Write a protein that binds this DNA or RNA. Sequence first.
DNA 1: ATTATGACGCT
DNA 2: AGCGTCAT
Length: 430
Amino acid sequence: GPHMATGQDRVVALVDMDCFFVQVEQRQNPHLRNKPCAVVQYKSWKGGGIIAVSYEARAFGVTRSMWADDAKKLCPDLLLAQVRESRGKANLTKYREASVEVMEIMSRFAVIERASIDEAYVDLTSAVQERLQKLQGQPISADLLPSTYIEGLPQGPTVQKEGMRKQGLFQWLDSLQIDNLTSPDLQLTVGAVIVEEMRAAIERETGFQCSAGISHNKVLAKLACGLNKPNRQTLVSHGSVPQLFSQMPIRKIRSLGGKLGASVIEILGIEYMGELTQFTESQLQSHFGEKNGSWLYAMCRGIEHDPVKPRQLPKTIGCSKNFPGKTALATREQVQWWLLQLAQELEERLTKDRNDNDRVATQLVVSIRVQGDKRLSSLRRCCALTRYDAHKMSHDAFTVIKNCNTSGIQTEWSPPLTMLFLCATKFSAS
DNA sequence: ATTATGACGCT
DNA sequence: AGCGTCAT
Ligand SMILES: Nc1ncnc2c1ncn2[C@H]1C[C@H](O)[C@@H](COP(=O)(O)OP(=O)(O)OP(=O)(O)O)O1
Ligand SMILES: [Ca+2]
Ligand code: NA
């Protein structure tokens, strides 16, 4: 009844760049603009592995994880840009620096949580309150929402995409109660107005287009963002949840894409998010644990409380390289040489981080995979990180893993290593 | 022979 | 601590 909280207290957005690494390459090389194109890493094995795909190229069926040689079979005119190689490994600096450009623009509008290299959550609750004051009961014009979709509309008693968008928006704005500063739907709408402004600023100042979701929490905002890509934003209201979730596969919701989501489906014998509403909170806790059960009970009702954390910078800085099949490292000299390459890249990034962000890492984590293990990581060990010096870091990393060498022979390494990873963690102000 | 990352949960 | 899950 009146005491039943509905998770409508906040306005949260998720802003995500469209085909991010591709846009970075298209900005730099105008010949790639408005073309089917993809970004690839390495080149020798099957033309390289695709890591980002333009929307033009997606229309041909090109996807992430595809080998470029195979992508070319679907899309013979596909254009490719290659990730830079330094010290024998892929170097993602150009994209990290592009990411910073976007995050700094978003930060002007509100506190953000960096969720990945190309996306951030935004807590707009206070910004919306402020804007509501300026508006002073004045209605919201569709002109302020030129790229916004209202999920679930139009509905009730044109055959073009943009036509439908506008009909939905009109129905939504027709129904709004602008006299109530505390209407959650009004708050979302003003939230969307602000996100239009944020997205315009990002595009003006960087050249990059993005999409966004606006809702009452991070999970719905993320889901919303994906509903209308590219270059559009989507408002998912609390009221839109029952119909949206009624046919929404469980795996689509963030954190349910893996084993947990599979177990929800298997154990409960359901397929869609909305079907979760028929279980009690205790029932869900019984199958999935106290924390997951409570989360599921609220989430299937559109309710989620995870805060937008005030964190714009990554918490760890890492460097990693695989050594698949016949390239696995089988000698001590090999292992030491590659640890050095990784350590040198890591030192470079750490030094820049210290200068830019007034902090120092204090722990070095070393991880390897051995040939045969289905797991991505086989062994992880930490040691102290007291100096930003690659030779020291590489020597220390070797020291902590050297006992893994099954080989009786000193110079040989067995089993061969198929992955090396160095990660700096535990930052302190400096 | 996806690869290169990065955040958070469990015990 | 070291491992596992999920994500981009
Ligand atoms: N599995 C991966 N391996 C390596 N790099 C990845 C992987 N997934 C994503 N990336 C990199 C390249 C992407 O351009 C960037 C952002 O990822 P993501 O947001 O999932 O897709 P995207 O921005 O390329 O397309 P979209 O428009 O669908 O969001 O991060
Ligand atoms: Ca993206
Ligand atoms: Na993303």
